[PDB]
Amino acid sequence: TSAVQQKLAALEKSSGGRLGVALIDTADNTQVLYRGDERFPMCSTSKVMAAAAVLKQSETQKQLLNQPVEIKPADLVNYNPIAEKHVNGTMTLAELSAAALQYSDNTAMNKLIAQLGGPGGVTAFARAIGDETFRLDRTEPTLNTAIPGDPRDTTTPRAMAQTLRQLTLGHALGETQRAQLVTWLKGNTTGAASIRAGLPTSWTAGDKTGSGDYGTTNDIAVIWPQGRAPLVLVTYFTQPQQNAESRRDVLASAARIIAEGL
Ligand SMILES: C[C@@H](C(=O)O)N1C(=O)[C@@H]2[C@@H]3CC[C@@H](C3)[C@@H]2C1=O
Ligand SMILES: C[C@@H](C(=O)O)N1C(=O)[C@@H]2[C@@H]3CC[C@@H](C3)[C@@H]2C1=O
Numbered sequence: 001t002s003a004v005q006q007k008l009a010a011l012e013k014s015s016g017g018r019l020g021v022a023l024i025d026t027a028d029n030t031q032v033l034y035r036g037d038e039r040f041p042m043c044s045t046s047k048v049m050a051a052a053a054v055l056k057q058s059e060t061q062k063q064l065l066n067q068p069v070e071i072k073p074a075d076l077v078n079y080n081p082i083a084e085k086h087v088n089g090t091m092t093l094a095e096l097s098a099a100a101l102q103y104s105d106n107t108a109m110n111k112l113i114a115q116l117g118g119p120g121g122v123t124a125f126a127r128a129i130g131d132e133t134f135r136l137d138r139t140e141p142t143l144n145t146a147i148p149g150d151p152r153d154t155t156t157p158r159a160m161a162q163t164l165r166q167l168t169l170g171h172a173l174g175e176t177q178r179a180q181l182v183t184w185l186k187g188n189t190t191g192a193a194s195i196r197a198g199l200p201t202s203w204t205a206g207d208k209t210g211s212g213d214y215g216t217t218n219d220i221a222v223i224w225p226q227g228r229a230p231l232v233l234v235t236y237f238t239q240p241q242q243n244a245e246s247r248r249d250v251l252a253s254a255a256r257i258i259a260e261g262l
């Protein structure tokens with residue numbers, strides 16, 4: 001029990017929900033965990049693994065990211081800010097990857113999942129890079145039901161922090177692919193209220209947010225603090241009632257606690 005864990009515990013108690021945190025500091029490879037081995041519903045944070053899996057495929061198919069995918073009216077789901085522009089046309093796997101990562105487009109995610117052979121294709125890729133915890137079971141939008149105690153479409157903070165580190169700072173992907181993933185994450189449009197809200201403004205970062213039922217509010221980030229080695233930080237949050245409201249502020253507070261303890 002560190003000072004940091006006690007602060008996170010205090011935040012959790014006043015939040016009404018359940019908080020999970022995992023930090024890896026690549027300066028010394030030390031970790032700070034809070035409910036690090038408990039499962040949480042990933043919601044849109046799973047888009048990172050799907051995008052990464054497609055990047056892996058592109059290592060042996062040089063033109064893969066230029067491959068077109070048909071977007072049909074029936075394909076549109078519940079949040080399609082990019083796909084809606086291209087219905088009855090096509091989008092490339094690059095376009096879909098960027099839409100999924102940077103705008104959290106749910107139709108684009110479904111296309112990535114299809115390209116991987118279904119949710120289990122995403123899980124297969126996680127296993128291939130050494131993540132024995134991640135599981136993707138469903139497509140969008142039902143992967144966001146986030147029912148307490150449900151193991152579907154979940155991971156642990158420890159596992160996601162490790163995987164994010166290997167994808168963005170390690171060798172799970174080819175160099176070109178790693179760089180592309182980082183570029184996409186740093187270009188995210190959805191993250192300014194979440195982990196990054198709790199960080200010193202001078203720092204740089206990329207992230208992927210997620211939200212769902214049970215007021216589930218998630219963020220996973222790769223962070224470059226001024227003057228030191230990168231960090232990986234995962235903050236997952238979820239609440240007892242199905243119609244609970246989002247709490248990005250809790251994620252920001254978690255990140256602030258983590259930042260002050262560095
Ligand atoms: C018990 C504790 C925990 O996470 O183990 N906890 C919750 O589940 C929610 C509900 C129970 C206490 C508080 C409300 C919030 C919390 O910290
Ligand atoms: C795209 C995704 C996300 O968290 O990134 N997402 C939401 O933002 C919420 C609102 C938009 C669609 C639904 C409600 C739920 C969802 O799937």
Ligand SMILES: C[C@H](C(=O)O)N1C(=O)[C@@H]2[C@@H]3CC[C@@H](C3)[C@@H]2C1=O
Binds near residue numbers: 082095098099102
């Ligand atoms: C949102 C924005 C736009 O033009 O309005 N946009 C892009 O920047 C590119 C990349 C990000 C999404 C897609 C690929 C395409 C797009 O629609």
